[PDB]
Amino acid sequence: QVSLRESGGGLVQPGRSLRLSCTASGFTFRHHGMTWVRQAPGKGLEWVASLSGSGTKTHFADSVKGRFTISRDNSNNTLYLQMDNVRDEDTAIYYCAKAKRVGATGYFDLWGRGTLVTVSSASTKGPSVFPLAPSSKSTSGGTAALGCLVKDYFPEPVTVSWNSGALTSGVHTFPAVLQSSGLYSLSSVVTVPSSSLGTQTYICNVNHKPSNTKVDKKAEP
Amino acid sequence: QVSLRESGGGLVQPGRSLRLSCTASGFTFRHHGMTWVRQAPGKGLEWVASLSGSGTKTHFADSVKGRFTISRDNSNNTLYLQMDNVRDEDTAIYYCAKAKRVGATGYFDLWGRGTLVTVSSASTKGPSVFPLAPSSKSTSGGTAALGCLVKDYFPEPVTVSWNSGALTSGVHTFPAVLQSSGLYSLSSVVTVPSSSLGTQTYICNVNHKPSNTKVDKKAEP
Amino acid sequence: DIVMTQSPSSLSASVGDRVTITCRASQGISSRLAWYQQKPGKAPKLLIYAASSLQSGVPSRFSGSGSGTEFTLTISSLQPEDFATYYCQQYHSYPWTFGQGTKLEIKRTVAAPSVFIFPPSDEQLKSGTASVVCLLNNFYPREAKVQWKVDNALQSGNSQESVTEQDSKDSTYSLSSTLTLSKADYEKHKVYACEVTHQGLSSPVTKSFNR
Amino acid sequence: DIVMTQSPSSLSASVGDRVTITCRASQGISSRLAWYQQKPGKAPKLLIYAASSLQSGVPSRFSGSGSGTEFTLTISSLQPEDFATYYCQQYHSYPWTFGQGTKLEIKRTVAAPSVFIFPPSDEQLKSGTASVVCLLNNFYPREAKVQWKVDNALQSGNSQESVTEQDSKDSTYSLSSTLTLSKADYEKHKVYACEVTHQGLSSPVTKSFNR
Amino acid sequence: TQTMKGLDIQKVAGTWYSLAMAASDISLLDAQSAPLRVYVEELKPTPEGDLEILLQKWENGECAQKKIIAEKTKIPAVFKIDALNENKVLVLDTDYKKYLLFCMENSAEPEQSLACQCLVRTPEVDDEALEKFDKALKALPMHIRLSFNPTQLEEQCHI
Amino acid sequence: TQTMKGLDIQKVAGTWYSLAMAASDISLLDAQSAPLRVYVEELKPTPEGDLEILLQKWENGECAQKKIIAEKTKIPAVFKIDALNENKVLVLDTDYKKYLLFCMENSAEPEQSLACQCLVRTPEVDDEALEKFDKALKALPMHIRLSFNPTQLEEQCHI
Ligand SMILES: CCCCCCCCCCCCO[C@@H]1O[C@H](CO)[C@@H](O[C@H]2O[C@H](CO)[C@@H](O)[C@H](O)[C@H]2O)[C@H](O)[C@H]1O
Ligand SMILES: CCCCCCCCCCCCO[C@@H]1O[C@H](CO)[C@@H](O[C@H]2O[C@H](CO)[C@@H](O)[C@H](O)[C@H]2O)[C@H](O)[C@H]1O
């Protein structure tokens, strides 16, 4: 039952302000200090702000003081983070962590998955999925390769499954890459027995929450 | 019953050491801080050393620190003062005083008469008492005058009483004077009814603790 | 600010050997140091705190020691799932600081990659550009060299690679290379080759196709 | 060291008027000041402490006030026995200091002295020297002039005076003058006179005797 | 706060010693240089019915002597100190001959300025007196208490 | 000194808070930078049967974290600290789930170094716990006591 679920993250414009919230469960919220930790794209961990169980003692990092304000609501078991006048340097996965004691202890035994906050003046763009048809070289071990190409989207992320979560074994989703157009591109492949490319159907399903667009594409030989 | 009686004073040689003791009564000794105050010949009061009720806290004056050591015995109600390596400047009347509170309070509600300490190199000398016989002028108001002359002694003091303390009214003991021989000389007179110079006996008693000599001399017409 | 300097920044060890990561503070921080474990897209885990206290639910093979300025995280029987980035954090003074992190990958027996090549999908070409995709499936080490030759002509800055994380099971890697060309330029030729070289291949493997 | 300066150093007041003695500290001493009373050969008595607290058993006519640096002891209905030296003492810091003191004598109506003369006791003469004694009994003021004339011849450095303390009742004084001479010189003459002059005498009183 | 009924001001006069003290906030007495760590020495009643108080308290690295006047009010055993904050003193109990119990609070913050003390006539430890003090305290939000020894009472500012 | 009987070391493990503390000598706890003013945080039992202790205490104008090992002895609920003076810890009582009471003394001076504390699992004020603490203290020569608030417990070194 013990868990931490953060939310509120999304695409925000330079100068605007966003409010992140963290939902707690499985423990007595008011008995533990809470803290926000962030991680900039492909960078290490960075502490942001901390708060005691009562919330009367908070602490921030200089790179955010005056702009961010931490808070907590001991009633709904929620931890908040007000981000005002957001700079580009604020783009990161904001993690929610729980301290071992009532005050800002320093170490945290419980973390949440985090929320991605992307600060750009860029507009949300849904991707385009293209099939990666099994080449005639489908006779390379009796197992043919195939996948999908989700091109030009923003911001991140973009989840991809095969045959609606049924096809797992052999699936290889590649990390997204930032194209020279500022848009993101990704690819997802899977290995299957070439002996089933005639009766079995292989379809990748990509979802881009930001663009609010789901897509189904079939990979045929 | 409440009183303070000091003793130990006498003639002491430069460099030698003497121990002064103060006996208390009429109050609870250990409940009060004690102090020593002295007074050099014809000079003002001078604080010497202090001690708390327990005696664990003592304090001295620079002019005596390292030479004098204060102490107390909460069993016999006695306050001590150890004078080592006595200088000439230590000649004075050492007064014993009781503090209002358990610590060295600073103010003292009870004092003793003091003891005279004379630090010199001269030798002790007992005085000579001569009678001051009532002149034939004993018919000057029906009251005749008569006294004693304690001459050539050292050091001081020298107490003088009349008829063993019984005769008080009219007694006038004069302050001692330093004679050109370095010795002290004093005189003590008393007024009595000339109509009793035939049935009453008048005898002055002088005691010189230093010389360790008591004396009785009668004053006849 | 106290600066935490971890070492090494990245390490490769065989499942079984004992690994040791160091962390040094820009100044004495007492014994207020913690070690966290973070895996791709997963919630960081607290392993050690107070320099040597082992968080509940963490295997005894993880240990931590140190004091004053130098601290160290030791992992005894390295497992295939011990792969991750380890971070040290201090909490002696504010701001609390993390170490640059140590990335630990698991060593394995060399494995040649299975190369595949995908032609641009007509739906894409019907836009203005074309993306040629080449796939390197299940291999080790991660080091691989891919080349794009159009009509037997090398290429540069026209392709980008992307590598998956080390499989939590087979401990292998998968790489993708995408060559970008305008729909017109794609028409200007017809011979597209993907020549791949890996330590598990005695000779370069080239998969190709024609418009 | 805190220096306590009292003022005045000596005072004369008629029994009944109110007297005031001042005491100033070389620095602020809060309200930690006390007033003691000392009489000849007697034990000093604590009158006031904490600047204005009156010690038990002390008549209400004694009062004390002041603060910081200036303090003052006031005596209302001055009595004949209020004669003594008053001292102030501070206990703010060590060493504890006393004031030079203020000597208070009781003003009184002039009173002539009763002069007497005592011949050398034969017991003394049988030693080698002779002491001639002259007594001034009960008088005021304290100022008195005594002269020794042997066979109508003045004297110098052959006599010494000694004065009693101001009687606690009649507020009068008593003086003694002793003329010293070798037993032989005493024999060289026979006319010994003691001429005394005082403000209470319209003319010098002379008491004498002959061997 | 349930204080003694009528009090005979004329009899509390004389010397006293601060045996023990307590306060609602640790900072009030924590560290010798505390704002409420005062020591009673003398209680001198004035003709107008007020009570002068001679006491000691730490002030800038030095023990200081101070004389305070607690003015009687229209309330039994309750006096007032003209000093800022309007500190109020309440006499909880007293036998006049051995012990005396009082508390003091600042009207400004009657939550973070409540100190109480147990005084005594002689510099001895009165166990029975401390008893009544502990008893009267079990109903107050005291978060710090101190008790002294005869030797400690020998100090103007208590060892 | 009449300590608890057999103690289940395995169950006292976990997080704790120092709610209240007392000492035989004021100086032992007087002023935050005291020599026995420590705060328990964690109790980690070792395999050999010993007990590791994570605590905080003031040291030269700064709160410091320290790990101490109380070695079990041939006496029920009595452990020993290898530190100088040979401080001995005694577990007076505990319910394992809410409170725990202990004292610590230095063999060198078993008269001027006796401190005791009341720990608790949650950062809340356990009146019943404090009760058992006051009760077990009425027989000891404590001359200073301190109790903390939930907010003060949010401080590594207690406000
Ligand atoms: C049975 C009888 C018992 C009688 C008990 C009488 C107790 C009398 C207590 C008086 C206490 C006065 O206590 C004192 O008050 C003043 C305000 O006036 C406070 O404030 C004072 O010091 C602070 C700094 O610390 C200054 O910033 C402030 O300007 C100054 O006025 C002191 O911090 C407090 O220590
Ligand atoms: C359920 C079981 C719970 C068991 C809890 C056991 C707690 C044991 C605590 C031991 C604490 C020792 O705490 C330590 O004591 C020493 C004296 O010996 C103090 O004094 C020490 O440091 C100071 C400077 O800070 C020096 O000036 C001093 O000479 C030195 O001895 C320390 O300031 C104090 O931090």
C160: domain CATH number? 2.60.40.10
Tokens at residue E13, please?
A: 């006069």
Structure tokens, B184: 């002290």
Between vectors from CA B112 to CA B107 and to CA B113, what angle results, nearest 5°?
A: 130
* Resolution of the experimentally solved model in angstroms: 2.8
Domain that includes residue D15, residue range: 1-107
User: From CA D75, how far away is CA D61, in angstroms rounded?
Assistant: 6
Q: With CB atoms and an 8 Å threshold, state whether E123 touches B31.
A: yes
Which residue's entry shows tokens 């009373």?
D37
Instruction: Determine the distance in angstroms separating the CA of F73 from the nearest CA of chain E, rounded to an integer.
Output: 34
User: Which residue is closest to C49 within chain A, CA to CA?
Assistant: A107
Token pair 């004069």 is found at B174
**Rounded CA gap, C190 and C187, in Å?**
7
H or E stretch at B39 = strand B34-39
Distances (CA, A) of C100 to A64, C103, F48: 20, 10, 37
On whether any CB of chain F is under 8 Å from the CB of A33, the answer is yes
Paired with A21 in beta bridges are: A7, A80
- Exposed, middle or buried: residue B147 (CB in 10 Å: 0-12, 13-18, 19+)? buried
Residues C161 and C82 in one domain: no
What b/e readout covers C63-76, taking b as 16+ CB neighbours within 10 angstroms? bbebeeeebbbebe
Whether residues B78 and B176 share a domain: the answer is no
Find residue F20's DSSP bridge partners: F118, F147
CB of B39 closer than 8 Å to CB of B49: no
Experimental method: X-ray
Same domain membership, residue A139 and residue A114 = no
Interior CA angle at E125 toward E123 and E128, to 5°? Answer: 130
Ramachandran bin of A3, using left for φ above 0, alpha for ψ from -120 to 50, beta for the remaining angles: beta
- Whole-number Å distance, alpha carbon F62 to ligand 2 midpoint, is 14
CB of C103 less than 8 A from some CB of A: no
* F156 lies within 8 A of chain A by CB: yes
Query: Which residue type is seen at F36?
Result: L
What are C106's two structure tokens? 């698991």
C24 lies in the same domain as C122: no
Interface check D50 vs E, CB under 8 A: yes
How does strand D102-107 pair with strand D10-14?
parallel
Which amino acid is located at F72 in the chain?
K
| Of residues C181, C121, C114, C116, the one with CA closest to residue C151 | C181
Closest residue by Cα to residue F41 from A77, C49, C45: C49
3-class state of residue F28 by DSSP? helix
Residues C197, C141 within the same domain: yes
* Token code pair at residue A32: 């533990």
Same domain, C119 and C203: yes
Point out which residues pair with F128 in neighbouring strands.
Answer: none
Domain boundary among A121, A148, A163: A121
Q: Which atom of ligand 2 is nearest to the CA of F84?
A: 18
How many other CB atoms are found less than 10 A from the CB of residue C103? 15
Residue nearest to atom 35 of ligand 2 (CA): F35
Four-CA torsion B157, B161, B165, B169, nearest 10 degrees: -120
A 10 A CB-CB count for A143 gives 16
Parallel, antiparallel or unpaired: strands C205-210 and C191-198: antiparallel
To the nearest whole Å, the CA of A57 is away from the closest chain F CA by: 8
The number of beta carbons lying within 10 Å of the beta carbon of residue C94 is 16
**Distance (Å) from the alpha carbon of E69 to chain F's nearest alpha carbon:** 30
Superfamily covering domain E1-159: Calycin beta-barrel core domain (2.40.128.20)
C-alpha dihedral sign at D198, D201, D202, D207: negative
Residue type, B162: W
Q: Which atom of ligand 2 is nearest to the CA of F60?
A: 25
Distance of CA B168 to the CA centre of its chain: 18
Residue E44: closest CA among chain D residues belongs to which residue?
D53
Of E49, D91, A44, residue with least CA distance to B106: D91
Pocket test for ligand 1, best of E39, E87, E92, E117 (most atoms within 8 A of CB): E87
Structurally, chain C folds into a number of domains equal to: 2
Residues A129 and A187 reside in one and the same domain: yes
Under 8 Å between Cβ of D113 and B172? no
Which segments of chain E are extended strands (E)? 14-15, 17-23, 38-45, 51-58, 63-72, 78-81, 87-94, 99-106, 114-120, 144-147
- Min CA distance, E132 vs chain F (Å)? 14
CB D43 within 8 A of CB B113: yes
Out of C76, C107, C138, a domain closes at C107
Coil, helix or strand for D163? strand
Residue with structure tokens 């020549």?
C195
Q: What 8-state DSSP symbol labels residue B123?
A: P
The Cα diameter of chain B in Å comes to: 65
Pick from A57, A101, A104: CB nearest F41: A101
Which of residues D52, D72, D107 is at a domain's end?
D107
Q: Express the helix, strand and coil content of chain A in percent, nearest 5 each.
A: 5, 50, 45
Question: What is the F35 CA–ligand 2 centroid distance (Å)?
Answer: 5
Amino acid identity of residue B133, one-letter, is: A
CA F159, CA F152: separation in Å to the nearest integer?
5
Q: D183 burial class (0-12, 13-18, 19+ CB within 10 angstroms)?
A: middle
Same domain, B70 and B135: no
Single out the residue of F158, F104, F95 nearest to residue F132, CA to CA: F95
Distance CA D107, CA D12 (A): 6
Contact indicator for E77, E7 with CB cutoff of 8 Å: yes
C90, C33 contact by CB (below 8 A): yes
Q: Radius of gyration of chain D from Cα atoms?
A: 23
CA E70 to chain CA centroid, nearest Å: 12
| Pairing between β-strand A184-193 and β-strand A143-153 as defined by DSSP bridges | antiparallel
To test the contact with chain E by mutation, choose from B27, B74, B102 the residue with the greatest count of E C-beta atoms within 10 A, namely B102
Q: Considering B121, B149, B173, which residue would you say is the last residue of a domain?
A: B121
What radius of gyration, in Å, describes the C-alpha atoms of chain B?
A: 21
How many angstroms separate the CA atoms of C76 and C62, rounded? 6
Q: Clarify whether residues A14 and A95 are in a common domain.
A: yes
SS3 D126: coil
List pocket residues of ligand 1, CB cut-off 6 Å: E 35, 38, 40, 53, 68, 70, 81, 83-85, 87, 89, 100, 102, 104
CA distance linking residue A113 with residue A39, whole number of Å: 12
Q: E103 near E92, Cβ under 8 Å?
A: yes
d(CA F51, ligand 2 centre) in Å: 17
Same domain, A12 and A23: yes
The reply to whether C168 and C211 lie within a common domain is yes
* Bond prior to D141 in cis (omega within 30° of 0): yes
- Which among A145, A190, A172 has a CA at the least distance from the CA of C172? A172
Tell me which H or E stretch contains F127: helix F127-137
Residues A68 and A163 in one domain: no
- Bridge partners (DSSP) of residue E54 are E42, E67
Give the sign of the dihedral formed by CA F114, CA F119, CA F123, CA F128.
negative
Query: What does the alpha-carbon distance between residue E32 and residue E57 come to, in Å, rounded to a whole number?
Result: 9
F 63-82 → C contacts, CB under 8 A: 64-67
CB contact set of F44 (below 8 Å; sequence gap of 6+): C53, F13, F51, F52, F53, F54
Same domain, D143 and D89: no
Beta-sheet strand order (sheet of D129-139): D114-118, D129-139, D173-182, D159-163
Given a contact cutoff of 8 angstroms between Cβ atoms, the answer to whether E133 and E140 are in contact is: no
Q: What one-character DSSP code corresponds to residue B121? A: S
Tokens of D196: 């005394």
Residue D129 sits in the same domain as residue D194: yes
Cβ of residue A109 closer than 8 Å to a chain F Cβ: no
State how far the Cα of B147 lies from the Cα of B130, in Å rounded to an integer: 9
Beta-carbon-side half-sphere exposure of residue D162 (alpha carbons within 13 Å): 21
Residues C99 and C167 in one domain: no
**How many domains does one find in chain B?**
2
**Are A132 and A105 part of one and the same domain?**
no
- Tokens 């032989």 locate to D184
CA separation for the pair C129, C117 (Å, rounded): 18
* Domain match, A126 and A47 both: no
Closest CA to B149 of B215, B221, B56, B82: B215
- The Cα–Cα gap between D36 and D21 comes to 12
Residues D3 and D32 in one domain: yes
Residues C151 and C85 in one domain: no
For residue E112, give Cα distances in angstroms to E29, E118, F150: 12, 20, 16
Residues D98 and D40 in one domain: yes
> Which of these three, C42, C72, C107, is where a domain ends?
C107
For residue A128, what are the contacts with CB-CB under 8 A and spacing of at least 6?
A: A150, A151, A152, A153, C124, C127
Whole-number Å distance between alpha carbons of A105 and D39? 73
A168 and A109 within one domain: no
Token output for B119:
């630090």
Cα E125 from Cα F96, distance rounded (Å): 38
Q: How far apart are CA B33 and CA C102, in angstroms?
A: 71
Lining residues, ligand 2, CB within 6 Å:
F 12, 35, 38, 40, 43, 53, 57, 59-60, 68, 70, 81, 85, 87, 89, 91, 100, 102, 104
Which sign does the torsion angle of CA E21, E27, E28, E30 carry? positive
Tell me, rounded to whole angstroms, the distance of Cα D80 from its chain centroid. 13
Contacts 24+ apart (CB under 8 A), C39-42: C39/C83, C39/C84, C39/C85, C40/C165, C41/A113, C42/A113
Chains that touch F (3 or more CB pairs under 8 A): A, C, E
Report the CATH number that the domain containing residue A4 is assigned in CATH.
Answer: 2.60.40.10
Q: What is the DSSP string of B137-177?
A: T--SSSEEEEEEEEEEEBSS--EEEETTTTB-TT-EEPPPE
Residue A16 to residue A84: CA distance in whole angstroms? 6
Spatial contact of A124 and A154, defined as CB atoms under 8 Å apart = yes
F101, F90 in Cβ contact below 8 A? no
* Separation in Å, CA of E144 to nearest CA in chain D: 31
**Domain extent at residue B175:** 122-221
Tell me how far apart the terminal alpha carbons of chain F are, to the nearest angstrom. 32
Is the sign of the CA dihedral E150, E152, E155, E158 positive or negative? negative
Q: Please give the backbone phi and psi of residue D183, each rounded to the nearest 5 degrees, phi first.
A: -50, -30
Q: How far is CA D176 from each of CA D117, D163, F22, rounded to the nearest angstrom?
A: 10, 6, 73
Q: Is C65 on the interface with F (CB under 8 A)?
A: no
Q: Which helix (H) or strand (E) holds A35?
A: strand A34-39
If asked whether residues D28 and D122 sit together in one domain, one would say no
Name which of C1, C31, C91 to mutate to probe chain A: the one with the most chain A Cβ atoms within 10 A of its Cβ: C91
CB B19 within 8 A of CB B85: no
Helices and strands of chain C, counted as H and E runs: 2, 18
Same domain, A93 and A18: yes
Do A76 and A165 fall within a single domain? no
Question: Which string of b and e fits F14-40 if b means at least 16 CB within 10 Å?
Answer: ebbbbbbbbbbbbebbbebebbbbbbb
Chain F residue with minimum CA distance to A28: F122
